[PDB]
Amino acid sequence: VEILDNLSNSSSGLDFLQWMCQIYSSKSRFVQNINYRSIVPPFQTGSRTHTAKFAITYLWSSLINCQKSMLIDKISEWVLTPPFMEDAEVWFIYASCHLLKADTLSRQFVNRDIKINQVIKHIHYVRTFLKICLDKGGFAVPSRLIENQLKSFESRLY
DNA sequence: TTCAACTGCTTTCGCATCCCAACTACTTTTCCTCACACTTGTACTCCA
């Protein structure tokens, strides 16, 4: 919080969470037998079947940071690369990155054969990443309320 | 008097199970720093 809420010559905290998720990337299994001294899982380590909290804070705070910069392609290219096949929160973020492109591009700037179908691609990415998010374990989304927003992107498109 | 397998031959130079390692633990190597129980007088009166 100190780098982001300093704002003077700041890295805004996002290059430091990038530092955390580079050198503490460890897909190793949690051996669950040794007594643990000076480490604890739920806030500072990142084993297999547990995404690290600095990893998902790097995903939330770079989606929100990219929204406020209006580069979403570059986060959507990164989230593509790690298919965390053990959790639903990364897939909700990956579904929500495409919802933001499907939100931004659904203004149409007229009152176009390529402007149409690209939004349909992002709408179909949301409906298929939210489905695989909901098939996983516990991450309860307002899955009705998001469908009201995807249809609203298409009614503006028609 | 014939059928059917065993048969060597196509060119001409030069190209072309055992080991290791990871990280985190627990442990040993010792050396340094003090206390805890014991005891005789002395002190303050004790009873003669």
Side-chain angles (χ1 to χ4, degrees), chain A residues 52-68:
Chain A
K53 296 289 284 185
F54 49 86
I56 55 174
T57 306
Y58 182 74
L59 289 176
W60 286 113
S61 181
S62 60
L63 199 159
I64 299 170
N65 149 231
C66 195
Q67 179 184 6
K68 291 169 68 177

Side-chain angles (χ1 to χ4, degrees), chain A residues 96-152:
Chain A
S96 177
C97 293
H98 290 294
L99 194 147
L100 208 151
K101 298 293 284 290
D103 189 13
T104 296
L105 276 302
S106 180
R107 298 295 189 183
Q108 294 297 111
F109 296 150
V110 174
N111 290 314
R112 290 178 291 171
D113 299 331
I114 303 168
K115 281 175 66 69
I116 301 297
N117 55 3
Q118 187 172 2
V119 180
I120 282 96
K121 291 174 174 63
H122 290 89
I123 294 295
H124 188 266
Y125 283 126
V126 174
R127 297 177 182 178
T128 53
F129 294 154
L130 190 70
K131 176 182 177 295
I132 196 63
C133 172
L134 193 147
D135 200 7
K136 300 287 185 183
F139 189 83
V141 302
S143 61
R144 178 183 292 171
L145 190 148
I146 300 168
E147 286 295 328
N148 296 114
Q149 296 304 108
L150 297 174
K151 179 180 69 66
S152 176

Side-chain angles (χ1 to χ4, degrees), chain A residues 8-19:
Chain A
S8 177
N9 301 108
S10 178
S11 300
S12 182
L14 200 67
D15 289 335
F16 173 67
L17 267 62
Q18 188 176 5
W19 186 84

Side-chain angles (χ1 to χ4, degrees), chain A residues 33-46:
Chain A
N33 197 4
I34 195 65
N35 310 324
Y36 289 101
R37 281 86 171 91
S38 70
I39 74 103
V40 80
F43 276 88
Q44 45 175 350
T45 61

Side-chain angles (χ1 to χ4, degrees), chain A residues 23-84:
Chain A
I23 80 156
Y24 294 112
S25 296
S26 177
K27 285 91 169 64
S28 67
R29 188 173 298 171
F30 190 75
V31 295
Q32 203 171 358
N33 197 4
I34 195 65
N35 310 324
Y36 289 101
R37 281 86 171 91
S38 70
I39 74 103
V40 80
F43 276 88
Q44 45 175 350
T45 61
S47 69
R48 192 188 293 266
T49 67
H50 165 61
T51 182
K53 296 289 284 185
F54 49 86
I56 55 174
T57 306
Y58 182 74
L59 289 176
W60 286 113
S61 181
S62 60
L63 199 159
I64 299 170
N65 149 231
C66 195
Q67 179 184 6
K68 291 169 68 177
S69 175
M70 296 177 291
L71 195 149
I72 315 166
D73 199 2
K74 288 183 183 180
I75 182 177
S76 183
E77 285 173 354
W78 189 70
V79 186
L80 182 146
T81 284
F84 284 109

